[PDB]
Amino acid sequence: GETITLQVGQCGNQVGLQYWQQLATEHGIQSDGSSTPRNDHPELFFTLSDSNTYTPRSILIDMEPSVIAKSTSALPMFNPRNVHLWINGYKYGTEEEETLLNLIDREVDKCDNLSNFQLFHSVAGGTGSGVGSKMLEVISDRYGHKKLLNTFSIFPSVQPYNTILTLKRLIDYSDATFVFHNDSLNRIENGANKLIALVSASVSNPLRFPGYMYSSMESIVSNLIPTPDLKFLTSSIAPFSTQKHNYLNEYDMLLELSNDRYKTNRVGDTSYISMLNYLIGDNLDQREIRKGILKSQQRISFVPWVARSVLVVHGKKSPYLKNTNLEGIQVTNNTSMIDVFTKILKQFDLLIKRKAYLNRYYSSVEEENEVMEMFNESRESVKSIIDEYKACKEITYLDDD
Amino acid sequence: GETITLQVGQCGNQVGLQYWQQLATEHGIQSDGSSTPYPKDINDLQLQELGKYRNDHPELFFTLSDSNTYTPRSILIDMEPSVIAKSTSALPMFNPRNVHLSNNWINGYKYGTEEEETLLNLIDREVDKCDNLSNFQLFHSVAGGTGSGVGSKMLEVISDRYGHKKLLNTFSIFPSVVVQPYNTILTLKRLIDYSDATFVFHNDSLNRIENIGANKLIALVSASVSNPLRFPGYMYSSMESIVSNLIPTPDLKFLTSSIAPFSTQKHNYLNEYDMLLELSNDRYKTNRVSGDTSYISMLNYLIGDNLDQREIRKGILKSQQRISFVPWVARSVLVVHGKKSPYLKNTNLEGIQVTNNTSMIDVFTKILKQFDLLIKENEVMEMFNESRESVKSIIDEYKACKEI
Amino acid sequence: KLKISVSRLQKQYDDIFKEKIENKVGVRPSVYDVLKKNQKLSVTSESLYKVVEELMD
Amino acid sequence: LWKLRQLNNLLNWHFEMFNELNHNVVTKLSSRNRRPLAKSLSIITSIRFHFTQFLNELIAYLSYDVIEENFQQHIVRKLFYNKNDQDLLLNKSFMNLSEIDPNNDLPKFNVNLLTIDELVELHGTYIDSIINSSLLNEKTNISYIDQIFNILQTIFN
């Protein structure tokens, strides 16, 4: 089925520009939307006119026109009709609810069979994070739960308040949320949006370049989310490619994809809940992959109550990329989320006991009570998810004792 | 049949000039009246190695002279000569004989009454050139001065001089000053009494569409309504047949039109299926319509070469469920497969939707409220009372339309 | 098997698989083009677990 | 089709005559009995509107799903588009076949070369498809045509 991309905020718009440039390069679509000389299926991400032009399905949302202007000028094939221009931002989103609801309904009507909503946004984006938090609520309300949502939220490197307020709605409404940290991205680079764009583009490779299996997003996601509570994913990318000293075999890709240094978020000891590895090359040797799967299963520490299966998808490289060597992406579901969530909660508590900057949000007695109850609910939800991820680790998870 | 166009008032003349230039462009008739040779048909395939003949009906509007020169069937009525001078200069094809030259509605109405014989002679002269006349088209503004009074008097004169044996449309433009509400109600009284089908255009909603001039949109809608007549197809091809499909009773005669704006921007509609869904949007209707509206009749125009039947069928099926039909009217959506003029180079589709919904309750309510506020020889006050009662006579009727 | 109309599956399969756009005279058809229209999907009375047992609702 | 369009136009004449009568008589009548007559006239005109909608939908279906589809599928697509067949699949140029015959003077004609019997059969099938369509076939143990004609008789009455 078709997918709709939502871009919110300055960071979201920049990441989306890199993402769409990568996708258009992979499908050979020119900057003006004209084709270049089919077995691939860009229709899932591009709308095809009866004049042979490809335009992205994405929707651009931002508080200021400079970022949107740069993005549109860089890629002229964006449709201008889809362009629209913390608590203050969220209340502003309430005012524009009708316009945005109709704007999204236009894209849904334009496609034939909708599958999922992609969202590119930054949790630490301030006002834009507020408008994206409202976007999740309105979409989930109007379209129910038949269509799932995927959020490629960028985590932060007064900010604690914003991170908690955005994470409350991220937990409530998102169906499968990727976690990216600028710290680990710049550590890997030792710009940064080119890693996120690459990971997001590769995550959907089996859909755009069909093969024997994994033809739908339901199959890709369902392998990684045993419970709707544990919805945060850790993504790992192998950087050593296109150099002379590349990984010599896909088997070494499978073994060295699990290194903790390549993960896109700060990690000690972790337990894996689910696994799925992407291998993308013109030709793939099966016996190497079998040996690598066996070693990966014998090496990785799974939680007791999970089936303990490692899945390797055999992605196909784009014809428009000339004979490049193998590359691969790893997406995992770990219990390492407790560390980052604990860090966020510690910062939030430290800055909530001290009334440092709450004057910018508490306007009156009723506003004080409103913000206090909202903050308490967000804190309780985050603690609930931490406790759930902690109870997953132990062996008595399925016991009623 | 034949159609006679009458333009009254400055706004009416401004709209009519572009309406006639649009028609002349579609039919390949130059501004001097000279005709252009007809290009070969596109779907009339022919074997291949590897002048007066036509298949349209332009003469339904233009009088074809013995010297192969076309001339519109238009009559221009107003008092200020500047607009008429501009219109004639832009289009020399207009017949000078057809031009007639001379704020309070009463003054204009009395002027029309005193000089009714000359205008009537002009109408009869235009009719005498027509064999098997079909209908009259009126372009006038409900409020604005000359247009209101003169158009109302011409409405009455034409209605009673021919025994109402031919239907009479009305492309009225509603206003977006102390005298304006009086003029609006006074003209709407005669619109109720005499007009057979009224196309309500609201200037504020036209400005809302534009910012995404205002007369160009009116000209486009008016010149696209009659597309089946000028390019005959399987269905309709008669002005009475199109109107009769949207007017269930004489009272529910007020129609409103929706326009798809993006006929030229390179991000135009992908296909017919997309445009069928986009036409129902309330942001491009020419009359402000709320969410409590209900539709009495549906009619969609499609203008393009070799439209895909699968897309149209699927679009009709999807759009039928979305539309909220009045309980006592069967769910029916009709699509007109118009033919694009071969003279036009643009290959993009255009589509105009004409609807008969119940949103008129709010519009006439606003007009009535403004009139009531402003009210707070004696003959004129009796006419005001009569107009108030006549307007209420269809206010309550459109309200009752909701009920089985 | 019997509680559903068989003839509908044929059509709902042809809309997916054997869709077509025609080509002008003299333009060579592709072999895929020729074999697309040949295929037919039909419901049969021999279930998989029964038909495979021979070659051992 | 002539019967259908005859009824479609008769409804238009009905609409015009009743609409004119509304302005000429009913609206000028005494206020005492104007209301009942207005109600009856509105009922009559609404019934006419229902019949017009039904006839228009029937005509639209026939015209743009039977006649037009059959024409584009059986005439245009048989004459001008390639009649791809299993013998046209074979590319004989794997043989050397340097020679060409009879001569370059013989045109290639943008249309499939049809035999006389082929032309007769082509036009016969094109007509047969329309006349023997799903709705127009002779197959409550009654055919669709009989029901349609019964509704047409209702409109005549």
Side-chain angles (χ1 to χ4, degrees), chain A residues 1-358 364-401, chain B residues 1-289 291-404, chain C, chain D residues 1-97 102 106-157:
Chain A
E2 299 85 66
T3 82
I4 292 170
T5 295
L6 277 91
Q7 314 189 29
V8 181
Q10 180 283 127
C11 329
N13 279 277
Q14 281 274 33
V15 165
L17 171 60
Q18 302 299 325
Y19 170 47
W20 283 112
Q21 278 197 353
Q22 175 59 26
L23 214 72
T25 302
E26 289 185 28
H27 291 295
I29 292 164
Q30 305 191 3
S31 310
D32 69 354
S34 65
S35 313
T36 306
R38 63 189 293 166
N39 268 265
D40 45 27
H41 287 78
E43 72 196 65
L44 309 177
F45 292 86
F46 294 97
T47 37
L48 175 57
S49 65
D50 292 346
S51 66
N52 187 49
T53 66
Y54 288 111
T55 84
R57 305 234 201 209
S58 97
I59 299 162
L60 303 181
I61 295 164
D62 185 24
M63 204 267 268
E64 302 191 10
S66 58
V67 191
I68 302 302
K70 175 172 289 296
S71 182
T72 307
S73 179
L75 206 61
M77 81 205 178
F78 267 83
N79 183 352
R81 295 185 66 203
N82 285 332
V83 163
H84 182 242
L85 300 180
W86 182 92
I87 181 159
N88 263 7
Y90 169 82
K91 275 185 167 69
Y92 150 78
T94 299
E95 302 299 324
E96 310 299 329
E97 174 170 306
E98 52 275 60
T99 304
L100 301 172
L101 197 63
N102 158 67
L103 186 63
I104 295 159
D105 289 345
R106 186 187 297 154
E107 290 295 332
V108 166
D109 296 342
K110 202 172 296 288
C111 82
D112 169 45
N113 183 32
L114 188 65
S115 181
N116 80 316
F117 288 85
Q118 290 191 332
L119 174 65
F120 288 88
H121 82 281
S122 170
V123 166
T127 56
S129 73
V131 66
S133 72
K134 185 64 175 180
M135 281 295 78
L136 295 150
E137 192 255 350
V138 288
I139 289 170
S140 209
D141 188 17
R142 148 171 297 278
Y143 278 84
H145 303 51
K146 261 143 211 170
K147 314 322 211 203
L148 84 162
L149 291 87
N150 300 69
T151 67
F152 304 108
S153 61
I154 279 83
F155 262 50
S157 168
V158 74
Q159 251 299 313
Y161 314 120
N162 299 303
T163 309
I164 272 296
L165 301 203
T166 278
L167 197 60
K168 165 64 159 57
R169 324 281 190 291
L170 217 76
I171 283 167
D172 291 337
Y173 301 144
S174 178
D175 312 74
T177 287
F178 285 69
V179 169
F180 294 104
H181 274 232
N182 295 289
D183 292 310
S184 301
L185 289 170
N186 62 62
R187 187 190 72 186
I188 284 167
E189 188 57 40
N190 280 359
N193 298 332
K194 293 179 179 179
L195 279 309
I196 313 185
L198 190 136
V199 169
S200 295
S202 305
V203 157
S204 58
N205 196 86
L207 313 183
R208 303 190 318 281
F209 290 103
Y212 289 96
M213 191 168 172
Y214 288 102
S215 195
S216 181
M217 201 75 168
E218 311 145 288
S219 309
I220 294 177
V221 179
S222 59
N223 289 337
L224 318 173
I225 315 293
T227 314
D229 305 84
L230 304 94
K231 80 180 60 52
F232 296 90
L233 290 79
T234 284
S235 75
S236 172
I237 164 169
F240 288 121
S241 66
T242 78
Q243 306 101 356
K244 224 78 192 85
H245 298 86
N246 61 273
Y247 300 103
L248 66 148
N249 294 317
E250 41 275 40
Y251 161 58
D252 319 303
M253 216 149 258
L254 291 161
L255 292 195
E256 271 86 340
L257 261 170
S258 304
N259 291 357
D260 304 338
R261 62 160 58 183
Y262 302 144
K263 289 187 192 306
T264 51
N265 43 297
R266 290 184 179 276
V267 178
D269 192 16
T270 58
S271 302
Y272 289 76
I273 281 143
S274 272
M275 281 285 268
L276 185 146
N277 306 348
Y278 294 90
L279 294 175
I280 305 175
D282 331 276
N283 293 293
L284 283 171
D285 219 6
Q286 180 65 23
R287 74 192 41 261
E288 301 325 290
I289 297 171
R290 287 201 297 257
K291 180 148 47 78
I293 285 165
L294 191 87
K295 300 295 184 180
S296 302
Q297 285 197 334
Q298 293 174 344
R299 271 178 87 153
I300 286 196
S301 306
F302 287 76
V303 285
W305 54 268
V306 161
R308 205 163 285 99
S309 64
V310 169
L311 295 156
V312 185
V313 312
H314 300 76
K316 286 160 56 177
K317 182 156 283 288
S318 171
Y320 297 100
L321 298 180
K322 293 179 179 179
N323 197 31
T324 316
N325 41 84
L326 175 65
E327 81 206 340
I329 288 304
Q330 167 149 321
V331 178
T332 88
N333 199 346
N334 317 336
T335 66
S336 68
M337 296 297 103
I338 67 181
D339 292 342
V340 290
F341 281 169
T342 41
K343 282 291 300 302
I344 284 154
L345 272 192
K346 290 313 184 64
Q347 295 273 21
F348 178 73
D349 277 332
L350 168 64
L351 209 73
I352 201 45
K353 304 302 320 313
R354 287 178 48 232
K355 213 195 78 178
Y357 320 111
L358 295 194
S364 177
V365 173
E366 80 280 351
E367 211 87 349
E368 277 172 38
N369 188 271
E370 172 164 299
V371 300
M372 269 327 100
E373 61 77 13
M374 171 46 58
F375 275 44
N376 280 346
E377 292 306 340
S378 305
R379 181 153 94 78
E380 288 299 325
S381 295
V382 175
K383 294 199 288 274
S384 179
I385 211 53
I386 273 174
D387 289 345
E388 168 66 85
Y389 261 105
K390 283 157 56 55
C392 183
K393 195 166 56 64
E394 55 160 55
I395 201 163
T396 82
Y397 188 49
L398 302 185
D399 300 331
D400 202 25
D401 305 336
Chain B
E2 267 83 354
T3 299
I4 289 167
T5 302
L6 319 166
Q7 308 134 324
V8 202
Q10 153 174 279
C11 294
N13 290 313
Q14 284 174 20
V15 171
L17 168 62
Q18 294 161 11
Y19 170 85
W20 282 116
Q21 275 188 327
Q22 169 81 30
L23 286 181
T25 307
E26 320 205 330
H27 291 300
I29 307 169
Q30 308 185 26
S31 69
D32 63 337
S34 186
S35 73
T36 307
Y38 203 75
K40 81 186 180 214
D41 289 345
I42 188 154
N43 66 352
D44 184 48
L45 309 180
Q46 298 194 1
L47 188 76
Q48 296 180 0
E49 300 170 47
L50 62 80
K52 295 187 190 293
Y53 294 158
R54 285 170 161 261
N55 62 355
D56 63 342
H57 205 196
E59 302 133 89
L60 195 135
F61 286 104
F62 308 90
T63 58
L64 175 53
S65 70
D66 50 3
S67 303
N68 196 16
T69 76
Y70 289 92
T71 289
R73 278 181 178 83
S74 59
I75 296 179
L76 299 135
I77 321 176
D78 63 335
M79 317 163 182
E80 251 285 302
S82 303
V83 307
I84 296 314
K86 287 189 292 185
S87 179
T88 304
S89 77
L91 273 183
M93 76 167 24
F94 278 130
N95 200 327
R97 278 125 50 152
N98 286 28
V99 170
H100 183 277
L101 294 178
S102 186
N103 44 47
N104 259 266
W105 182 90
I106 295 289
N107 292 67
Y109 188 84
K110 284 288 188 281
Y111 166 53
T113 300
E114 182 82 356
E115 237 179 52
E116 72 185 290
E117 67 93 45
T118 299
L119 269 309
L120 185 49
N121 175 279
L122 190 44
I123 308 304
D124 298 328
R125 180 221 201 78
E126 284 314 310
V127 168
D128 285 350
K129 299 179 173 299
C130 279
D131 42 330
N132 194 239
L133 200 75
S134 165
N135 75 311
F136 295 82
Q137 282 186 326
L138 185 74
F139 286 94
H140 79 319
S141 182
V142 193
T146 89
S148 316
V150 183
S152 183
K153 187 54 179 174
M154 281 295 78
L155 221 43
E156 182 253 1
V157 162
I158 294 169
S159 160
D160 309 86
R161 251 297 318 265
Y162 294 170
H164 218 99
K165 303 298 180 248
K166 306 128 185 164
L167 75 93
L168 166 49
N169 307 101
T170 295
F171 285 77
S172 53
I173 294 169
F174 276 66
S176 45
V177 182
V178 294
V179 81
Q180 292 207 11
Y182 297 144
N183 295 12
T184 304
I185 212 77
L186 278 206
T187 304
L188 198 90
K189 191 283 185 193
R190 282 80 186 173
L191 287 193
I192 299 276
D193 275 298
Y194 307 135
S195 161
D196 220 333
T198 305
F199 288 81
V200 173
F201 296 98
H202 202 305
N203 260 1
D204 281 324
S205 198
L206 260 287
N207 290 330
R208 183 71 65 162
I209 304 171
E210 170 56 36
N211 77 267
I212 310 173
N215 298 325
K216 283 281 191 74
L217 277 76
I218 312 294
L220 261 53
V221 173
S222 311
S224 296
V225 161
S226 64
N227 185 281
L229 320 181
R230 311 189 317 279
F231 299 102
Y234 288 81
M235 299 170 312
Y236 311 127
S237 62
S238 196
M239 180 51 87
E240 47 219 42
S241 76
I242 295 166
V243 162
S244 166
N245 200 88
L246 313 180
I247 301 194
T249 75
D251 285 73
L252 289 107
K253 90 182 84 185
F254 283 70
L255 313 181
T256 196
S257 50
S258 168
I259 170 158
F262 293 117
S263 62
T264 185
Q265 184 182 110
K266 64 179 180 180
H267 306 279
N268 58 311
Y269 314 120
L270 321 183
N271 52 46
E272 304 89 337
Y273 166 86
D274 154 41
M275 171 145 48
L276 255 287
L277 303 183
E278 210 206 57
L279 277 168
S280 76
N281 200 317
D282 315 344
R283 276 283 317 259
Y284 311 122
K285 302 226 165 65
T286 58
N287 163 335
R288 166 62 43 112
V289 53
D292 197 23
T293 191
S294 47
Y295 292 81
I296 307 143
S297 280
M298 211 43 193
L299 192 69
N300 295 305
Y301 288 80
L302 294 186
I303 311 180
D305 277 15
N306 52 261
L307 307 179
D308 294 326
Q309 188 56 217
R310 286 161 321 279
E311 308 278 281
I312 281 140
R313 194 61 31 181
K314 198 167 67 169
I316 290 172
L317 264 287
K318 279 203 182 185
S319 198
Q320 178 187 0
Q321 308 165 46
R322 206 179 316 287
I323 278 195
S324 50
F325 276 99
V326 168
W328 59 265
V329 152
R331 292 218 156 182
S332 86
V333 175
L334 279 147
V335 159
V336 175
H337 298 63
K339 305 182 194 300
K340 186 143 214 207
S341 171
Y343 281 114
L344 297 174
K345 294 320 182 293
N346 158 5
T347 59
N348 190 23
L349 297 91
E350 301 102 38
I352 299 331
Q353 166 190 299
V354 179
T355 43
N356 192 356
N357 52 58
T358 58
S359 67
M360 319 304 168
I361 299 168
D362 307 301
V363 178
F364 291 138
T365 299
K366 266 183 142 283
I367 288 304
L368 198 77
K369 275 171 47 59
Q370 284 168 342
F371 170 70
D372 283 345
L373 260 54
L374 261 284
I375 277 274
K376 304 323 155 296
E377 296 196 320
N378 187 53
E379 61 156 320
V380 310
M381 189 151 63
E382 182 169 320
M383 249 165 195
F384 279 124
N385 184 31
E386 287 289 355
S387 297
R388 174 91 170 61
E389 292 163 295
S390 184
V391 170
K392 199 65 157 66
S393 202
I394 63 138
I395 289 284
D396 43 18
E397 195 298 354
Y398 265 103
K399 286 180 176 188
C401 183
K402 300 294 301 194
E403 305 190 332
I404 64 170
Chain C
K1 292 185 296 180
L2 303 186
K3 313 308 298 183
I4 179 63
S5 52
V6 181
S7 61
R8 280 192 69 190
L9 295 185
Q10 282 69 79
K11 174 33 52 173
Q12 294 197 265
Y13 168 112
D14 316 278
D15 325 291
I16 301 270
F17 281 86
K18 65 172 62 145
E19 91 296 10
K20 183 82 191 103
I21 302 293
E22 287 287 13
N23 43 32
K24 306 301 183 70
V25 63
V27 180
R28 292 298 318 310
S30 69
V31 62
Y32 183 46
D33 190 319
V34 183
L35 281 299
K36 261 196 298 180
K37 66 178 187 179
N38 276 24
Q39 64 180 20
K40 175 156 50 74
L41 173 132
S42 61
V43 173
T44 63
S45 50
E46 288 269 60
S47 175
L48 202 173
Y49 308 122
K50 299 179 72 71
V51 83
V52 84
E53 183 73 15
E54 183 91 50
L55 62 80
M56 199 44 226
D57 303 335
Chain D
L1 260 159
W2 167 262
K3 275 171 169 168
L4 285 180
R5 265 157 174 79
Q6 169 194 354
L7 277 173
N8 190 11
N9 174 83
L10 266 166
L11 293 175
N12 290 333
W13 288 339
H14 175 286
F15 164 67
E16 162 48 15
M17 71 162 147
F18 268 80
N19 175 265
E20 164 267 306
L21 170 150
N22 176 69
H23 177 256
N24 268 329
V25 173
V26 192
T27 192
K28 294 177 177 284
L29 210 65
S30 67
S31 308
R32 162 172 38 152
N33 215 54
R34 181 177 181 170
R35 275 78 187 201
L37 248 197
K39 187 67 169 290
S40 303
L41 165 63
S42 300
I43 282 158
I44 282 277
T45 323
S46 71
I47 291 161
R48 188 266 320 156
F49 156 77
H50 287 154
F51 292 154
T52 307
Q53 282 200 149
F54 158 74
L55 271 180
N56 260 347
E57 254 156 32
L58 171 59
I59 290 295
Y61 164 69
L62 287 181
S63 301
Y64 293 110
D65 276 356
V66 184
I67 293 148
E68 211 66 50
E69 291 256 20
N70 285 193
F71 184 84
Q72 174 69 3
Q73 177 183 320
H74 291 276
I75 291 275
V76 174
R77 178 175 299 163
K78 286 290 191 284
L79 288 170
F80 296 91
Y81 302 156
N82 195 343
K83 55 170 177 67
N84 53 84
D85 270 305
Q86 291 90 337
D87 56 356
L88 264 296
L89 156 54
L90 203 184
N91 173 43
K92 288 172 61 79
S93 74
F94 81 94
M95 302 175 58
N96 180 273
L97 297 180
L106 212 53
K108 292 174 63 179
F109 263 121
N110 184 58
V111 188
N112 298 317
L113 302 179
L114 309 188
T115 42
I116 287 180
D117 181 65
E118 181 66 10
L119 285 166
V120 178
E121 171 285 348
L122 169 68
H123 194 214
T125 56
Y126 161 60
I127 278 166
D128 289 345
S129 190
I130 279 147
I131 187 154
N132 293 338
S133 151
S134 53
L135 191 73
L136 308 186
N137 274 320
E138 90 280 11
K139 298 296 298 296
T140 70
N141 208 10
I142 219 162
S143 71
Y144 300 92
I145 292 286
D146 297 315
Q147 298 179 51
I148 286 160
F149 268 125
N150 292 347
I151 301 176
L152 297 194
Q153 280 292 336
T154 305
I155 296 175
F156 273 141
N157 298 341

